[PDB]
Write a protein that holds these residues in place. Structure first.
Motif, PDB file in Angstrom:
ATOM      1  N   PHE A  57      11.104  -2.895  -5.968  1.00  0.00           N
ATOM      2  CA  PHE A  57      10.689  -1.994  -4.718  1.00  0.00           C
ATOM      3  C   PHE A  57      11.838  -1.139  -3.893  1.00  0.00           C
ATOM      4  O   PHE A  57       9.677  -0.282  -3.749  1.00  0.00           O
ATOM      5  CB  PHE A  57      11.055  -3.187  -3.530  1.00  0.00           C
ATOM      6  N   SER A  64       7.815   7.533  -5.434  1.00  0.00           N
ATOM      7  CA  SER A  64       7.111   7.672  -3.993  1.00  0.00           C
ATOM      8  C   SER A  64       7.256   8.506  -2.800  1.00  0.00           C
ATOM      9  O   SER A  64       6.733   9.655  -2.910  1.00  0.00           O
ATOM     10  CB  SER A  64       6.193   6.475  -3.181  1.00  0.00           C
ATOM     11  N   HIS A  98      -1.311   8.230   0.598  1.00  0.00           N
ATOM     12  CA  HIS A  98      -0.540   6.915  -0.682  1.00  0.00           C
ATOM     13  C   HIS A  98      -1.953   6.377  -1.133  1.00  0.00           C
ATOM     14  O   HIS A  98      -2.142   6.085  -2.732  1.00  0.00           O
ATOM     15  CB  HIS A  98      -0.602   5.493   0.669  1.00  0.00           C
ATOM     16  N   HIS A 224      -1.939  -2.647   2.164  1.00  0.00           N
ATOM     17  CA  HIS A 224      -0.621  -2.352   1.213  1.00  0.00           C
ATOM     18  C   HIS A 224       0.241  -2.555   2.742  1.00  0.00           C
ATOM     19  O   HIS A 224       1.713  -3.188   2.543  1.00  0.00           O
ATOM     20  CB  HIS A 224      -0.053  -1.268   0.780  1.00  0.00           C
ATOM     21  N   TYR A 247       4.841   5.595   7.105  1.00  0.00           N
ATOM     22  CA  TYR A 247       4.052   4.632   7.968  1.00  0.00           C
ATOM     23  C   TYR A 247       3.954   4.164   8.921  1.00  0.00           C
ATOM     24  O   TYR A 247       3.679   3.562   9.546  1.00  0.00           O
ATOM     25  CB  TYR A 247       5.183   3.661   6.803  1.00  0.00           C
TER      26      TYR A 247
END
Ligand SMILES: CN(CCOc1ccc(C[C@@H]2SC(=O)NC2=O)cc1)c1ccccn1
Lengths: 251, 14
Positions: A57, A64, A98, A224, A247
């Motif tokens: 992860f 990213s 994203h 997601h 986010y």
């Protein structure tokens, strides 16, 4: 006017090549053996290849973070984008990045796995599916998307325009000045339509199929964020700062 | 505003 739409397409392709060191052309050559990546297919090979689900992860997060910076550079080469209000530049990237990450991830995927570390590794789909819940389902929607998307056989010159269209979306929440964004996007859409007619004349309704992929990508990101809310309440690790910012209040 | 909530994205855009 058509010749101007081709010059816009070419500008975007040239910009894309400057911004993205690992293109689809290069990735497909690595994936079909025409140039070798280190293969990670189990726990033993993950060790050889350099808590496991959390390490993976975190690796995806750091990729990213790099990708956001590449994508931002590319966005700044789309004519008109840097002249938008800075608030609107930030909103477009916040809600767009994203969708682009997952589009470009597909370029590095086949039905059996994904390129990592700029093509120096390949991680199998089965290995990712083997991770303990809920991490065993993190990647599977992205592979599902990629197999369908890659069947459209887009090239880098097509992707450059598709990505620009997505970034210049005038329906993102909180945009201050929609009209200039929609005007840029309408011209990008005309350039995309002409690109697909010229580069894929045998592929009927390719344009309509791509417009639908833009909707599908939104569903991927929504799903997601749902998985992240599960992860955050079942675990106790936090996001990289740039991802925290993106986010936060992302639908 | 948006700008104030996105220090890092602003830096990258600038
Ligand atoms: C499976 N691979 C390939 C990259 O695969 C990615 C999968 C998801 C993302 C999005 C990240 S992950 C998150 O929650 N939010 C994000 O922005 C980004 C990349 C890797 C790559 C490096 C190390 C380990 N494995």
């Amino acid at each position: 006017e058509s010749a101007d739409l081709r010059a816009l397409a070419k500008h975007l392709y040239d910009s894309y090549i400057k911004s993205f060191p690992l293109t689809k052309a290069k990735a497909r050559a690595i994936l079909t053996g025409k140039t070798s990546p280190f293969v990670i297919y189990d726990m033993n090979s993950l060790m050889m290849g350099e808590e496991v689900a959390i390490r993976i992860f975190q690796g995806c997060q750091f990729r990213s973070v790099e990708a956001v910076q590449e994508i931002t550079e590319y966005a700044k080469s789309i004519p008109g984008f840097v002249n938008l209000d800075l608030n609107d530049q930030v909103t477009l990237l916040k809600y767009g990045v994203h969708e682009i990450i997952y589009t470009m991830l597909a370029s590095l995927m086949n039905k059996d796995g994904v390129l990592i570390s700029e093509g120096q590794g390949f991680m199998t789909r089965e290995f990712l599916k083997s991770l303990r819940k809920p991490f065993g389902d993190f990647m599977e929607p992205k592979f599902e998307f990629a197999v369908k998307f890659n069947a459209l056989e887009l090239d880098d010159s097509d992707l450059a325009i598709f990505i620009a269209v997505i970034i210049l979306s005038g329906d993102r929440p909180g945009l201050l000045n929609v009209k200039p964004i929609e005007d840029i996007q309408d011209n990008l859409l005309q350039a995309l339509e002409l690109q697909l007619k010229l580069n894929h004349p045998e592929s009927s309704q390719l344009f309509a199929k791509l417009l639908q992929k833009m909707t599908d990508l939104r569903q991927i990101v929504t799903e997601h964020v749902q998985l992240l809310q599960v992860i955050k309440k079942t675990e106790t690790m936090s996001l990289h700062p740039l991802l925290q910012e993106i986010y936060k209040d992302l639908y | 505003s948006v700008x104030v909530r996105h220090x890092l994205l602003t830096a990258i855009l600038x």
